[PDB]
Amino acid sequence: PSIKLQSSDGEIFEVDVEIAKQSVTIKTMLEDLGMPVPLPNVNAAILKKVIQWCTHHKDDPPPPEDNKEKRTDDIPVWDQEFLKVDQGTLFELILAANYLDIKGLLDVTCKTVANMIKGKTPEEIRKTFNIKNDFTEEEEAQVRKENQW
């Protein structure tokens, strides 16, 4: 069986239902009726890679969640390669994962972003992310000097 998904830019994709249910959102639409499913909140190329990721993880065992807590060293090799994209696509992947409710993809994309923060200084963060510093120098000095871990 398959399911027709329509991007918000109109494009249509053919996906295995068991691959598509990875999105809890899509799964709960399918149950709701059935007698393309519009994804008004997802671009096409985004929806193209989300389908890719789900097809790779369609056979995963369920993830143990206790002992088990936030950690960033957990990213499978394949996901690290699939996630070598531009910063734009990366954030769009997060938003897509929230809209479609795919925690595996949401957790793995956040782990990537977090990895490009860890160990780096405020200035590098800003350079990495293009974040405009808004601190008055007294404010910026105050803050860092304001506290030490």
CB of 75 to another protein, least distance (A): 11
CB of 121 to another protein, least distance (A): 7
Residue type, 44: A
> How many residues can be counted in the chain?
149
- Closer to another protein by CB, 4 or 126: give it: 126
- Closer to another protein by CB, 54 or 93: give it: 93
76 contact partners, CB below 8 Å, separation of at least 6: 108
Residues at the site binding another protein, with contacts judged by CB under 8 A: 70-72, 91, 94-95, 98, 106, 110-111, 113-114, 117-122, 125-126, 131-135, 139-140, 143-144, 146-149
Three-state SS string over 65-119 comes to CCCCCCCCCCCCHHHHHHCCCCHHHHHHHHHHHHHHCCHHHHHHHHHHHHHCCCC
- Closer to another protein by CB, 60 or 139: give it: 139
